[PDB]
Design a protein around this motif. Structure first.
Motif, PDB file in Angstrom:
ATOM      1  N   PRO A   1       2.370   8.886  -8.753  1.00  0.00           N
ATOM      2  CA  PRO A   1       1.471   7.738  -8.915  1.00  0.00           C
ATOM      3  C   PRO A   1       0.385   7.716  -7.852  1.00  0.00           C
ATOM      4  O   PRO A   1       0.485   8.356  -6.803  1.00  0.00           O
ATOM      5  CB  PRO A   1       2.407   6.534  -8.777  1.00  0.00           C
ATOM      6  N   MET A   2      -0.674   6.967  -8.143  1.00  0.00           N
ATOM      7  CA  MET A   2      -1.834   6.871  -7.271  1.00  0.00           C
ATOM      8  C   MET A   2      -2.122   5.413  -6.937  1.00  0.00           C
ATOM      9  O   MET A   2      -1.745   4.503  -7.680  1.00  0.00           O
ATOM     10  CB  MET A   2      -3.058   7.511  -7.922  1.00  0.00           C
ATOM     11  N   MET A   3      -2.790   5.197  -5.804  1.00  0.00           N
ATOM     12  CA  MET A   3      -3.116   3.862  -5.321  1.00  0.00           C
ATOM     13  C   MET A   3      -4.603   3.782  -5.010  1.00  0.00           C
ATOM     14  O   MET A   3      -5.154   4.680  -4.368  1.00  0.00           O
ATOM     15  CB  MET A   3      -2.296   3.512  -4.075  1.00  0.00           C
ATOM     16  N   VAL A   4      -5.246   2.710  -5.464  1.00  0.00           N
ATOM     17  CA  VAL A   4      -6.661   2.471  -5.219  1.00  0.00           C
ATOM     18  C   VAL A   4      -6.818   1.120  -4.537  1.00  0.00           C
ATOM     19  O   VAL A   4      -6.207   0.130  -4.956  1.00  0.00           O
ATOM     20  CB  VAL A   4      -7.483   2.510  -6.523  1.00  0.00           C
TER      21      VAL A   4
ATOM     22  N   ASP B   1       1.329   6.483 -13.077  1.00  0.00           N
ATOM     23  CA  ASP B   1       0.871   5.111 -12.914  1.00  0.00           C
ATOM     24  C   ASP B   1      -0.199   5.020 -11.836  1.00  0.00           C
ATOM     25  O   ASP B   1      -0.148   5.724 -10.826  1.00  0.00           O
ATOM     26  CB  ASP B   1       2.042   4.200 -12.557  1.00  0.00           C
ATOM     27  N   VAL B   2      -1.174   4.144 -12.059  1.00  0.00           N
ATOM     28  CA  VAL B   2      -2.257   3.907 -11.113  1.00  0.00           C
ATOM     29  C   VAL B   2      -2.289   2.418 -10.807  1.00  0.00           C
ATOM     30  O   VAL B   2      -2.393   1.596 -11.724  1.00  0.00           O
ATOM     31  CB  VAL B   2      -3.613   4.382 -11.659  1.00  0.00           C
ATOM     32  N   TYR B   3      -2.196   2.073  -9.527  1.00  0.00           N
ATOM     33  CA  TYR B   3      -2.212   0.691  -9.075  1.00  0.00           C
ATOM     34  C   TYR B   3      -3.495   0.424  -8.304  1.00  0.00           C
ATOM     35  O   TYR B   3      -3.855   1.193  -7.406  1.00  0.00           O
ATOM     36  CB  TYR B   3      -0.996   0.390  -8.200  1.00  0.00           C
ATOM     37  N   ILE B   4      -4.182  -0.658  -8.656  1.00  0.00           N
ATOM     38  CA  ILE B   4      -5.433  -1.046  -8.018  1.00  0.00           C
ATOM     39  C   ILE B   4      -5.196  -2.327  -7.236  1.00  0.00           C
ATOM     40  O   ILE B   4      -4.657  -3.301  -7.775  1.00  0.00           O
ATOM     41  CB  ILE B   4      -6.558  -1.233  -9.050  1.00  0.00           C
TER      42      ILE B   4
ATOM     43  N   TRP C   1       0.803  -1.215   0.000  1.00  0.00           N
ATOM     44  CA  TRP C   1       0.000   0.000   0.000  1.00  0.00           C
ATOM     45  C   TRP C   1       0.838   1.269   0.000  1.00  0.00           C
ATOM     46  O   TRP C   1       0.275   2.360  -0.128  1.00  0.00           O
ATOM     47  CB  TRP C   1      -0.931   0.006   1.208  1.00  0.00           C
ATOM     48  N   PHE C   2       2.156   1.163   0.140  1.00  0.00           N
ATOM     49  CA  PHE C   2       3.016   2.330   0.234  1.00  0.00           C
ATOM     50  C   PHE C   2       4.233   2.159  -0.661  1.00  0.00           C
ATOM     51  O   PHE C   2       4.639   1.039  -0.980  1.00  0.00           O
ATOM     52  CB  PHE C   2       3.461   2.574   1.679  1.00  0.00           C
ATOM     53  N   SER C   3       4.800   3.283  -1.069  1.00  0.00           N
ATOM     54  CA  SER C   3       6.012   3.283  -1.863  1.00  0.00           C
ATOM     55  C   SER C   3       7.218   2.998  -0.978  1.00  0.00           C
ATOM     56  O   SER C   3       7.158   3.176   0.242  1.00  0.00           O
ATOM     57  CB  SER C   3       6.181   4.624  -2.564  1.00  0.00           C
ATOM     58  N   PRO C   4       8.329   2.546  -1.565  1.00  0.00           N
ATOM     59  CA  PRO C   4       9.526   2.291  -0.746  1.00  0.00           C
ATOM     60  C   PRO C   4       9.994   3.505   0.033  1.00  0.00           C
ATOM     61  O   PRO C   4      10.487   3.359   1.158  1.00  0.00           O
ATOM     62  CB  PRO C   4      10.564   1.843  -1.783  1.00  0.00           C
ATOM     63  N   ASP C   5       9.855   4.703  -0.530  1.00  0.00           N
ATOM     64  CA  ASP C   5      10.287   5.909   0.159  1.00  0.00           C
ATOM     65  C   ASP C   5       9.265   6.426   1.163  1.00  0.00           C
ATOM     66  O   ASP C   5       9.609   7.280   1.985  1.00  0.00           O
ATOM     67  CB  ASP C   5      10.607   7.007  -0.858  1.00  0.00           C
TER      68      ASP C   5
ATOM     69  N   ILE D   1      -8.710   5.991  -2.243  1.00  0.00           N
ATOM     70  CA  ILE D   1      -7.805   6.556  -3.238  1.00  0.00           C
ATOM     71  C   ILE D   1      -6.931   7.595  -2.550  1.00  0.00           C
ATOM     72  O   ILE D   1      -7.443   8.479  -1.854  1.00  0.00           O
ATOM     73  CB  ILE D   1      -8.573   7.182  -4.415  1.00  0.00           C
ATOM     74  N   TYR D   2      -5.619   7.492  -2.749  1.00  0.00           N
ATOM     75  CA  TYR D   2      -4.662   8.388  -2.113  1.00  0.00           C
ATOM     76  C   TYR D   2      -3.371   8.354  -2.912  1.00  0.00           C
ATOM     77  O   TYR D   2      -3.090   7.353  -3.579  1.00  0.00           O
ATOM     78  CB  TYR D   2      -4.410   7.977  -0.656  1.00  0.00           C
ATOM     79  N   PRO D   3      -2.569   9.412  -2.867  1.00  0.00           N
ATOM     80  CA  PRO D   3      -1.325   9.433  -3.642  1.00  0.00           C
ATOM     81  C   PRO D   3      -0.241   8.577  -3.012  1.00  0.00           C
ATOM     82  O   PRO D   3      -0.324   8.157  -1.859  1.00  0.00           O
ATOM     83  CB  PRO D   3      -0.928  10.911  -3.624  1.00  0.00           C
ATOM     84  N   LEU D   4       0.798   8.326  -3.803  1.00  0.00           N
ATOM     85  CA  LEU D   4       1.974   7.585  -3.366  1.00  0.00           C
ATOM     86  C   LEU D   4       3.192   8.495  -3.261  1.00  0.00           C
ATOM     87  O   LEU D   4       4.309   8.110  -3.608  1.00  0.00           O
ATOM     88  CB  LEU D   4       2.263   6.417  -4.306  1.00  0.00           C
TER      89      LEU D   4
END
Lengths: 313, 86, 153, 37, 151
Positions: free
Chosen positions: A198-201, A240-243, A26-30, A255-258
Motif C-alpha cells: 500500500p501507498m500513503m499520500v 490500497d492508497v490512503y490520502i 502516517w505509518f503502518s502498525p509494523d 508520497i511514500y510506501p507503507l
C-alpha cells in the motif's frame, strides 16, 4: 511512591486525557518498533555486490577471469534528548486559588500541576509530530531560527537522496502541471521487489481542494483525485492508497510506501513526554517542573519517497 | 541610560509590585522596543522611557529577532542582555 | 578524505535494485580481471599509496625497507590494496601485469600512460594503456581503467 | 506493568517511568487495532 | 580534543596525589558553586577552555558560539560534548575560576581575551593565579579567575 509524591500520582491520573499523536496514521502498525535509548546512536550494516566487468568466455585454456566485488555500508541513526520547563502552583497553595469554577490565578497565568502538565504535554507532542513530518524543529511561522540538530536525523520531507519535484510559480494553480510533476516523480520511483505494498499520500489543504475539481473539457465522474489514485495503483500492484491532509504541510505533496522493508520508524521508547523527578520549590506558591522527550529514529531507503514542492513565490 | 538598575519581567497590579532581574544577572526574553527599526544582530540601548532602541552603550544587549507589532505602539523584540560594556 | 573506506557514515540504506555502473567506487580493491597465477607482495606502507604506483624506500638501516607512492625510473610495482590496521600495502610487481582502476593525474581508450613522481597516471617510457576515460569521484580524484605491461621504450 | 492496570503500585520513580512507556505502547497498539482505514 | 583519542600504551600509576590536575582533560572549575548559571550552545569549531562569542547566521538556523573575545566576548566554555556538538558556556556575568588556554605570564598579571579566545597580557577580564603550564608544543594553560569586564 504515590503516597509520598503527589506529582507522580497527579500525572498517572491525568495521563489518559492526553490525545494520541496524529503521526501514527502516517505509518503502518509494523513500520514502528521501539528501541531502548535516550541519547546515542544505533548503527546497522548492509552488504552489496557489484560486477566489475563483462563475463569471461570459457574457451580452450584461460586463467584471467572477471571478478565480482562486494561493498559494505554502515547506516547510523542519531537520538537526541530534549527538555522543557514550566511553572505551576504548589500543591499546598491550590486551596487559596480554588475559585468556584476555575482553579488558578487568571491574572498571573498560573495553573495547577495537573492542568499545566496536560497542556504542556500536548504542545510537546505537536512539536514532535511536526518534526517527524518536516524533519526540522522551529517555533516560528516563517520557520526560521531552527534548532541545529545532529546529522543522521531526518524527517519524511527533508530526507536526502529522494525524488524531488518542483512546480514553477507560473503553474501554481494549473492542476495539470502539478499532476505532470507527480507523474514524472512516480516514474522515477524505484520500489524494486517491494512494489506490492500500500501507498500513503499527504497533501496540504490547498492541494486537497484542487484535487476534487473535475479532471481536465471537464470530465464526468472523473476528478483529479481519482486519476491520482489510479496512477499510484499502476505502480503499487493495485494496492490500497490512503490520502491524508495535514495543516502542518504547506504547498507540499508527499508520497511514500507503507512497507517496513523500505521505510521503518525506530523511535526511542522514551520519545513521548515523561515527567522529571526534579521539582523546583521555593518559599512562594510557584513551583517549576521539567518534561523530557527524545527525538530521532526514522530510517528510509534511497529513492523511495516523492517530494513535490509547489513554488508559491 | 546610565541609571539602569535592572529590568522588570512581571507585575502584580493588585499589590502594585514589580519583579526585577538585576543587571548583574543575564536575561533572554521579549522586551518593549522604541519602534520597528530594529533588525537581528543589532546593538540596543535603553532609552529614558525604558524602551530598547537601535544604537555609547553602557550595557550589551543584542536583538535576536525583529520587532513584532501587537498594538498601535506595542513593539516586542526578543533580546538577550548579558551585563555591561567597558 | 582519501582512505579506501569512507570514515563518514551513510544516512540511508542503499537501493540494491540496479546492477549497472556500481563498480566505479574508490573502495573497489584488487583488479577487474584477476588470475590465480598472480604474484602479490605486502610491504610496510609509507604514507597512503593506495591505487598508486609505488617505489622502494630505504631508511637509515634500523628499520626494514618500505614502499612509498612514486614512479619514473624508480617504479617497482602497483599497490592494489591496503590494510589500515596493519599498515601493509599489497603490491603487485612490475614484472606481473595488472588490469584495474588506478589514480589518474588531474584521456581516451588507447592512450599511452606513464607513472609520475606521485604514483599517478598521466598521458605520455610507456607502462600502461588506458582502457576507458577518466571517471571523477571527487574534485581531484580521477580513476581510470588501465592495463600495465611493465616497462618498454 | 502499565498505568492502565489498577493493580500496579510503582515502588520508585524509575518503575513509574517504565510504566509510562508501557502505557504509551499499549495505547499505540490499541489505536492501530481500532483504526480501520 | 578534551579527551586524548589516542589510547595509552600503559596502565597509569595511581600512587602519587600531587600535580595530577594539570591536564587538558580537566573539565569545569577548581572551585564550583551550586548557584552557578550554566548554559549550552551549538559548538562552532573547538572553543573548549576558551572565551566564546555569539554568532548569528542568516536566520535559517539559531545562534551558536565560536571561540573569540574582545568587545564580542559572551562567556567562557568550560565543557563540551562531542556527540551532541554542545558547548557548556558560563556567562560573562557569572564569575569563573579555573584553568584556561593561554597565548604562548606570572601571577598577579591582568589578562584579556584575544580574537581567538586565548588569554594574553594587557579593559581587563581576569587575573592570572599561576604561571603558564605547557602541555603541548603550542598548548599553554593557566589558572585564572574571571570577574567580568572592567576598564
Amino acid at each position: 511512591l504515590f503516597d509520598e509524591n503527589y506529582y507522580a500520582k497527579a500525572v498517572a491520573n491525568i495521563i489518559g486525557e492526553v490525545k494520541d499523536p496524529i503521526m501514527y496514521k502516517w505509518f503502518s502498525p509494523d513500520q514502528i518498533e521501539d528501541v531502548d535509548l535516550q541519547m546515542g546512536y544505533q548503527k546497522t550494516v548492509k552488504w552489496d555486490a557489484f560486477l566489475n566487468a563483462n563475463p569471461t568466455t570459457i574457451a580452450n585454456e584461460v586463467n584471467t577471469i572477471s571478478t565480482i566485488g562486494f561493498s559494505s555500508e554502515v547506516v547510523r541513526l542519531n537520538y537526541l534528548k530534549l527538555q522543557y520547563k514550566f511553572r505551576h502552583l504548589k500543591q499546598t497553595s491550590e486551596k487559596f486559588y480554588t475559585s468556584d469554577s476555575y482553579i488558578g490565578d487568571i491574572n498571573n497565568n498560573l495553573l495547577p500541576f495537573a492542568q499545566a502538565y496536560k497542556l504542556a504535554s500536548s504542545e510537546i507532542i505537536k512539536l514532535i509530530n511536526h518534526f517527524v513530518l518536516t524533519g526540522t524543529v522551529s517555533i516560528q511561522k516563517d520557520g526560521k531560527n531552527q534548532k541545529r540538530l545532529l546529522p543522521n536525523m531526518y524527517g519524511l520531507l527533508n530526507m536526502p537522496e529522494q525524488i524531488k519535484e518542483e512546480v514553477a510559480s507560473g503553474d501554481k494553480d494549473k492542476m495539470d502541471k502539478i499532476f505532470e510533476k507527480i507523474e514524472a516523480g512516480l516514474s522515477k520511483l524505484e520500489l524494486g521487489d517491494e512494489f506490492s505494498t500500500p501507498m500513503m499520500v499527504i497533501v496540504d489543504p490547498a492541494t486537497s481542494l484542487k484535487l476534487v475539481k473535475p479532471y481536465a473539457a471537464a470530465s464526468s465522474c472523473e476528478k483529479w483525485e481519482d486519476v491520482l489514485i489510479q496512477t499510484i495503483k499502476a505502480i503499487n500492484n493495485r494496492e490500497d492508497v490512503y490520502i491524508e491532509t495535514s495543516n502542518l504541510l504547506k504547498h507540499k505533496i508527499l508520497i511514500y510506501p507503507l512497507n517496513s522493508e523500505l521505510i521503518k520508524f525506530k523511535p526511542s521508547k522514551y520519545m513521548l513526554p515523561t515527567p522529571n523527578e526534579q521539582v523546583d520549590k521555593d518559599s512562594t506558591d510557584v513551583a517549576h517542573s521539567y518534561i523530557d522527550f527524545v527525538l530521532g529514529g526514522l530510517l528510509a531507503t534511497r529513492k523511495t519517497i516523492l517530494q513535490v514542492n509547489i513554488k508559491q513565490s | 541610560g546610565e541609571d539602569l538598575y535592572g529590568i522588570c519581567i512581571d507585575i502584580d497590579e493588585f499589590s502594585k509590585t514589580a519583579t526585577i532581574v538585576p543587571i548583574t544577572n543575564n536575561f533572554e526574553g521579549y522586551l518593549v522596543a522604541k519602534d520597528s527599526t530594529v533588525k537581528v544582530k543589532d546593538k540596543l540601548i535603553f532609552n529614558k522611557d525604558g524602551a530598547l532602541e537601535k544604537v555609547k552603550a553602557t550595557i550589551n544587549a543584542t536583538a535576536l529577532t525583529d520587532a513584532k507589532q501587537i498594538s498601535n505602539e506595542v513593539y516586542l523584540v526578543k533580546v538577550a542582555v548579558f551585563g555591561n560594556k567597558a | 578524505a582519501l582512505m579506501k573506506n569512507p570514515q563518514q557514515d551513510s544516512g540511508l540504506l542503499s537501493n540494491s535494485i540496479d546492477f549497472r555502473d556500481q563498480n566505479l567506487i574508490f573502495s573497489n580493491s584488487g583488479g577487474v580481471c584477476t588470475s590465480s597465477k598472480d604474484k602479490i607482495e605486502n610491504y610496510p606502507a609509507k604514507g597512503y599509496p593506495y591505487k598508486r604506483g609505488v617505489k622502494l624506500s630505504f631508511g637509515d638501516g634500523t628499520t626494514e625497507l618500505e614502499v612509498e607512492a612514486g614512479g619514473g625510473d624508480d617504479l617497482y610495482g602497483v599497490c592494489s590494496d591496503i590494510d589500515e590496521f596493519s599498515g601493509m600495502a599489497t603490491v603487485i610487481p612490475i614484472t606481473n601485469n595488472f588490469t584495474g582502476y588506478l589514480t589518474l593525474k588531474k584521456v581516451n581508450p588507447g592512450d599511452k600512460l606513464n607513472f609520475n613522481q606521485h604514483g599517478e597516471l598521466e598521458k605520455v617510457s610507456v607502462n600502461a594503456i588506458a582502457l576507458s576515460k577518466a571517471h571523477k569521484l571527487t574534485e581531484d580524484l580521477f580513476i581510470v581503467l588501465a592495463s600495465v605491461f611493465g616497462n618498454r621504450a | 506493568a502499565s498505568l492502565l492496570d489498577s493493580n500496579f503500585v510503582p515502588i520508585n520513580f524509575t518503575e513509574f517511568v517504565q510504566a509510562i512507556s508501557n502505557t504509551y505502547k499499549q495505547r499505540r497498539i490499541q489505536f492501530y487495532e481500532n483504526l480501520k482505514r
